[PDB]
Amino acid sequence: GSVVGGLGGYAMGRVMSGMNYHFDRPDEYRWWSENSARYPNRVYYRDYSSPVPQDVFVADCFNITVTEYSIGPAAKKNTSEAVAAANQTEVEMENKVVTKVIREMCVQQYREYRLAS
Numbered sequence: 001g002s003v004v005g006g007l008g009g010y011a012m013g014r015v016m017s018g019m020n021y022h023f024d025r026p027d028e029y030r031w032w033s034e035n036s037a038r039y040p041n042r043v044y045y046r047d048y049s050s051p052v053p054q055d056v057f058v059a060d061c062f063n064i065t066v067t068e069y070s071i072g073p074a075a076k077k078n079t080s081e082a083v084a085a086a087n088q089t090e091v092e093m094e095n096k097v098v099t100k101v102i103r104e105m106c107v108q109q110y111r112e113y114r115l116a117s
Contacts, residue, residue, distance in 0.1 A: 010046055030097075035101055
């Protein structure tokens with residue numbers, strides 16, 4: 001077997017679910033709850049050239065990870081998302097929660113990568 005089961009050639013992140021997060025309160029509980037709707041625990045990064053900073057690395061890491069899981073501002077092309085379907089504020093929160101988790105994770109990798117020998 002070769003081809004078809006891997007067209008992208010992206011690099012896999014670790015399982016990472018349960019880093020230092022604050023989230024104690026009932027409304028902050030939505031951050032954990034809404035995260036629980038999807039909980040990716042991991043990210044995909046690409047073969048960036050090297051002279052690209054964490055800012056960009058984490059951002060494109062995020063954009064590709066959400067593209068793969070069909071979430072965030074980058075699922076079906078780039079199109080209309082201001083609609084009622086599954087409560088716009090609920091999905092918007094789930095959206096920010098997952099955009100943040102995926103970003104937060106690619107930084108959590110980056111920071112441990114910097115700390116690593």
